[PDB]
Amino acid sequence: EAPNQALLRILKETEFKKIKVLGSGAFGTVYKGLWIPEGEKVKIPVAIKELSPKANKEILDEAYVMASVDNPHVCRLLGICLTSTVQLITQLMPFGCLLDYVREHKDNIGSQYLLNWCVQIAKGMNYLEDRRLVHRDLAARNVLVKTPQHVKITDFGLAKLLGAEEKEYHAEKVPIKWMALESILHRIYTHQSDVWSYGVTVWELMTFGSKPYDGIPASEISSILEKGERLPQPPICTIDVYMIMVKCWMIDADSRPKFRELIIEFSKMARDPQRYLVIQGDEPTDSNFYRALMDEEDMDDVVDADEYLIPQ
Numbered sequence: 198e199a200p201n202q203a204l205l206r207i208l209k210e211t212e213f214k215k216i217k218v219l220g221s222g223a224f225g226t227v228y229k230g231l232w233i234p235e236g237e238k239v240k241i242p243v244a245i246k247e248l249s250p251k252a253n254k255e256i257l258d259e260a261y262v263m264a265s266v267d268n269p270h271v272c273r274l275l276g277i278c279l280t281s282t283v284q285l286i287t288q289l290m291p292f293g294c295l296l297d298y299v300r301e302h303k304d305n306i307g308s309q310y311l312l313n314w315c316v317q318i319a320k321g322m323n324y325l326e327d328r329r330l331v332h333r334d335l336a337a338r339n340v341l342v343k344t345p346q347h348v349k350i351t352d353f354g355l356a357k358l359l360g361a362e363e364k365e366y367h368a369e370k371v372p373i374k375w376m377a378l379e380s381i382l383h384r385i386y387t388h389q390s391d392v393w394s395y396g397v398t399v400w401e402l403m404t405f406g407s408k409p410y411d412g413i414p415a416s417e418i419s420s421i422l423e424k425g426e427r428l429p430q431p432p433i434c435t436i437d438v439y440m441i442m443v444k445c446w447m448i449d450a451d452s453r454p455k456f457r458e459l460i461i462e463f464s465k466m467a468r469d470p471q472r473y474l475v476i477q478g479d480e481p482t483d484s485n486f487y488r489a490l491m492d493e494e495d496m497d498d499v500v501d502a503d504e505y506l507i508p509q
């Protein structure tokens with residue numbers, strides 16, 4: 198489409214420090230860290246990722262994808278550090294992923310927060326659809342929590358930018374339980390295939406972190422969805438909400454709702470949240486807070502990445 202004039206920033210290894218490991222899985226290792234631009238008098242909480250020539254190619258692909266997106270509900274890239282293994286510096290989300298958050302605070306999450314998260318996730322995905330970007334890994338684990346009122350979409354290791362005349366992406370290890378049926382059978386990925394993963398993501402939030410298709414091997418899932426079986430209706434979900442999930446899981450990809458329409462539907466429900474989610478008993482940004490998770494004492498000059506918009 199248009200020329201991608203995004204600026205790729207290079208960060209010095211001495212400007213930032215690692216603090217603790219947040220996760221060490223197949224992707225690599227994600228660190229909690231602090232970035233201090235030299236001479237800026239600013240401390241920025243960051244997340245650092247590192248995955249050989251093949252490792253440097255994949256993370257530079259992720260840096261290329263993240264540098265092309267800038268949206269309040271999409272994690273922003275801060276830059277890369279050119280070590281032997283090039284590292285990915287992103288904005289740190291202090292409260293973690295939404296999957297662990299709904300499990301830890303299951304008895305304290307109201308209907309207003311669940312519906313608000315659905316609106317924000319759809320806003321981020323609709324922006325990615327505007328950017329011709331297919332995420333291919335939309336899940337509750339990849340929706341991180343900046344604040345309980347603000348979430349962002351993350352993990353672009355599988356994200357693929359589309360050509361202007363490219364309607365679908367043809368793939369050649371994936372999360373089977375979140376993929377659309379056409380993605381499992383024909384390796385076809387589309388913005389409508391992300392709507393399917395969006396439906397599973399909402400199902401994770403409404404079940405407060407239940408594993409979809411729990412106890413079922415991923416090999417048998419292709420035959421389950423093909424027979425017409427879907428995820429069950431969560432107990433707190435009214436039919437208004439569960440109908441939206443079923444629409445995201447329809448066989449016809451074009452029949453599924455668009456992220457633009459999902460923003461509207463969940464926004465209407467957010468006006469009257471107790472009418473669409475039935476939860477019993479439906480009724481923190483400080484300098485001290487950052488001192489704990491960053492394990493630092495002097496946090497007067499802390500600035501979140503959303504408030505740091507600095508050309509180098």
Ligand SMILES: *CCC(=O)Nc1cc(Nc2ncc(C(=O)OC(C)C)c(-c3cn(C)c4ccccc34)n2)c(OC)cc1N(C)CCN(C)C
Pocket residue numbers: 219220221224227228229244245246272285286287288289290291292293294295296297337338339341351352490
């Ligand atoms: C769902 C598990 C999880 O997210 N764990 C987690 C995450 C975070 N916050 C955070 N912030 C930024 C990033 C990130 O974008 O990393 C870039 C790619 C460098 C991440 C993150 C992204 N991926 C792919 C991860 C994998 C494993 C771990 C983190 C990431 N995450 C925090 O903030 C403190 C904590 C946290 N866990 C450890 C919290 C444990 N809960 C049980 C409370």
